[PDB]
């Protein structure tokens, strides 16, 4: 099941969760040219809600309700964009964050390809661009937007499992933690830059 | 003044500041295989203590105490890694934390020399290697120890003044908060890896 | 249809429209070194010509003459090279160009690929070297040189639909009108250079 | 003699003249992150005016019917960049331009040294960052920003000769018309991108 | 077979062989971060001996005895990076060692390819990551694991024919006997250093 | 039919033509250090020499009086290195020479693949290590080995046709009148360098 | 003594030599854009004569008489270069020539710069751009380009030297001989090939 | 005191020490093309021995049985080089030897500047190409040789210490082992391979 909305959710049901698959679709890579065109939300449940998002809005008072609640984890692959995008469209920063990739990172040291397609593939043997501005997306492009989402809860269990089992929690959350402020620099304009490097 | 210690601190005398300048000399770059060899410290009075740090030396409870006390900031450049080696040597890792490089990476956009020479040099007209596991250290060597923390405390004034001009002290805030941890994954074994890059 | 031709077109029929689409196949990338072969243009109606130019050949009345109509917009895929041959060749360089390579590069920002195969692919579901200088082109090489032209029309549409949508048409607009003279900098020596690089 | 001005010219007095050599101070090379500080003017007489912007000053009557007057010149070295950051300063773009850049790698093709300091060491014999926001500049500030204006129109004069001998005439005037187009393309956006190149 | 044991050897039946095949599987290729998590033997026999290493486990008293043992040559494909893992987990650095990988250096001097599985093909035409930390490997993990030790005795009885052929048994034999120092080399903190480089 | 030979031709017969192509394997791109292993010969009739020479060879008569035959044009595909280790073997440098990859070079301007398996499958539609050195080659290798000679006048014919074509007789000539003594220079010790570079 | 002359030598007297040296200037690396300026010539008797060379002049019938006599070897310092220019703006490729820079890369193996000054400094320690088109040269600008002739002479009798002693004199000959080829496959398009390199 | 002697030691006397500093003079980096012209030899003692190598000599028994003596340790900066140098020409390969360069790299590596000039300024405070060929060398060559030889075993004792105090003696020792075996496979052709990389 995939429910297509315009603009925001209809309300906040099937969101009482206590965390939340967070995916987005841009024109490109850049947030300061390339508008959020769709949002992607999960609850966990095998289903998955896909807003459009028009040229121009400034407001989802639903979506920006859950995107800014405390109580509920975002989950995200490589959130230092989707969190980027998000801050930029709306004007709010999730600082409860959870990020596959960097947990990737962190725990599967034993491979140098942390994409989305390897990790569902190693982790899970599940098998995972175009105009996201059209008008009406097709269901080719619904069902894809719909799959990046899907399977990001599972993950998340596998990675809270291997990073309490090599003693890396701390080091995990002191990551997350920092990770909307990395966003943060990344819209202020130090996207090219590692602040932390000597050169 | 130049105080020449060995192992320890005598006391925390003239130590009861608001923050500290801290520098380190080592064997090299690598905490793993370079030990420790020097400290630096200075109030900011214009006086500087050189403590020499023995092979193998496990404590130094009255330096140790300094460096864990949270209401002390601790002023480094380029603290990534001597935060890294403090840890390594006895065990503590700062967590009230200020670095002249981070700050001068956040507030002197129009240039791409961040290294202290050259910060002392813009912003104060001051003018600023050699087997620092010596038993018996040179004159020369204690003066240059000496001369990478008589400026610290200026440079912050400076760059907390910067910092407040152009509306940046929450990330600046935010980026030392983290600044421990990148030291603690440099040394679990991340020193070469961007954890925040996409590859 | 596929209509071959040696020299010149035989006179304008079928070419009193709005937009033609224009290539060229050559010996290779360097104008001075390398001979224009085949000339390949389409009206738009599904059909092509494809003209065969003569080693040494100076003069080609009819198609310079729809070369330098300003009436009529040339199309090209990477028009930079064409232009470039195409002035080389008859010493004619067109004024009114639009190019599928720059419009690309200015709408298609989501991707990196920018090549007409890949243009052909996502734009329109549509699947997309050799001794150009024989006597006798091969049936092959004729369906190949005519395929090269066959759907610049519709990419043109598609492009200046998605110009509109992203208020760029008069970034686009300008470009185009630059682009013979980015041309002739490449016939006149600075092939290799970017004009407005710093450096 | 260097006239400081807070904010705007006085009057346009002075400023009657044919061409006007300009250049601009910053914070830094990205104009959406690194402010305007300081404009520079010069008739040619040798003279200069130095202008000093306000942190979020918006506009400026005098200076920017200055900049608009289509019947005034602008000389610039890399006026890609002090166009970017005027339009975006004030929101007008200038399209009556001459960059000694441009026309140095048009015309100095025997060197591949195309800085102000070559350029004027080169054809005049002259001999050529900072906290640019300070609120009260140096007297050495003052200087050397006059110091960048003071000899444009020299190298306006001779870059014309040198052009009109090796009959690039049209050719620099077609870049320079296209320059306000480049500058427009580095603000929205494709500042890393040769628009032209074929990858 | 596959014999699959927990922490060490039952005893070292089967193992009183002039030469044995191992190799390692580990968390990754640092061995100061990455443990060593699986240990594969070969007699040469057609079996294989799958040793689960567990989290924190110091002694393998007959494993270290075979590994120790000067008498039987441990055979290794890339022996650089087992012989600093299994050093830095039990303690013992085999000095009796032959090396599949530098021979395949020394000798097939007509590739650039010294993989094991192009090595196999080529000499014997055989064809042939995962989480190594598992409490239980799967079948195929089992599997894969000893396929990596199966064949080394019959590359290394053709690796020393063709080292004999070309008169190349000396210096096969003094890298062989440096390998332990390389790998200690690395363990200590030189990994990416050349060291008989001259920069 | 393959004629397999030990050490040297039994005569000069069915070689009486007025060109040879041919072409070596060895053990590896360094002359000084890889053996010559085979040497392969046609005279473009459909069938091939394919002889085997021994470890330390120092004549071959009737072959080096072939190769010495200044009557009879010597057909490669990269001459260079054949040149070489056949000078280097046999102690005679023939000089007149042409090559299949400088011709490709000099007429395939419109690809930048010059491989022996791209040349015949563009101008001939025909589809084209090991141990070289084995005492007794395979029905496989002695297959392979003659493939690379039996079609190499087929394409110093076409070769030749467009070198007439594109008026650039002269060149080649002179091109395969210095490849001997490039192979030369390469033998002495200048194999990595470009005699004529600036750098 | 330096002779400066407009367009051609009035006569060919002192230019009864064996070998004379010669250097060229003009504006820039690229024949097809860069005119030939200034032509310099010496007998070795340690003057000069510098030949000013007017644009668009197709003819200087004593000059081209000199670079045509066979019998006269022509001395120059890269001349792959400056073969091209002369070629281009004459008409005539001399075929007598030697190059101190091939000569330097044949016999100063020792050293890694083979440029004009390093050469003149270890070989006779003797210590060695700007507006050569303009209508009159300065004084600095002819002993300058004289400076670049004065010297062959001498260059050229001590590198026969060293070709004499290291046994090389063939393999310069044969360089030599191919030199103007080379120069020839520049100016017809191949400049940056290396023709020889397997890619 | 530099006693220069033709083609050897006239005798073995002030040659009895226990460690011998040892360096080589050649025309180039290739032992292959390039022959060894001159030797330096000291004792200690403040003197030095020069030897001139004539060419094609092949013989030096008094220096050669120097260099075979097992009981003397000879002492190279970089003797990679020069070890293999002198077994190519002698036929001699030393096989107790030590290396600065080697020493160095294990021991300051709070620096990644080794050379000799750089490592005699640090550890001593002292202040450190031509035709080597020439018949007769000029006291400034004469000077220059025996410069490199006068200190090496001064470095030789800081070096021993540091190694002690670092407790790297036996890496040390196992490097210097080794190191002949570096210098004959760099002999054999693998000089451009790090035969212990993974690639």
């Known amino acids: 099941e995939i429910r297509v909305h315009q603009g925001d959710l209809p309300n906040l049901d099937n969101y009482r969760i206590d965390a939340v698959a967070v995916d987005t679709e841009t024109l490109g ?15 966990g449940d095998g289903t998955a809600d896909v807003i459009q998002i028009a040229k121009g809005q400034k407001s989802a ?3 920006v309700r859950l995107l800014s609640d405390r109580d509920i984890t975002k989950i995200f692959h490589f959130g230092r964009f989707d969190l980027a995008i998000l801050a930029h469209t709306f004007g709010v920063m999730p600082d409860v964050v ?3 990739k960097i947990a990737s990172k962190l725990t599967r040291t034993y491979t140098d390809r942390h994409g989305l397609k390897e990790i569902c593939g190693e982790l899970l043997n599940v098998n995972i661009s175009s105009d996201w501005a059209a008008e009406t997306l097709s269901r080719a492009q619904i069902e894809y937007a ?4 899907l399977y990001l809860h599972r993950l998340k269990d596998i990675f809270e499992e291997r990073l309490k089992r090599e003693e890396r929690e701390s080091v995990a959350k002191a990551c ?17 830059i590692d602040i932390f490097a000597h050169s």
């Not at 890579?29 to 609850?43: A, G, I, K, T, Y």
């Not at 719909?146 to 989402?149: E, G, M, Q």
């Open 29 to 43: 890579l850049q947030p300061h040219r390339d508008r959020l065109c769709v949002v992607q939300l999960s609850s």
């Open 61 to 63: 008072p639903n979506l």
């Open 98 to 100: 959870f990020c596959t």
């Open 146 to 149: 719909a799959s990046d989402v």
């Open 176 to 192: 997350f933690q920092f990770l909307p402020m990395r966003a943060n620099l990344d819209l202020l304009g130090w996207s090219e």
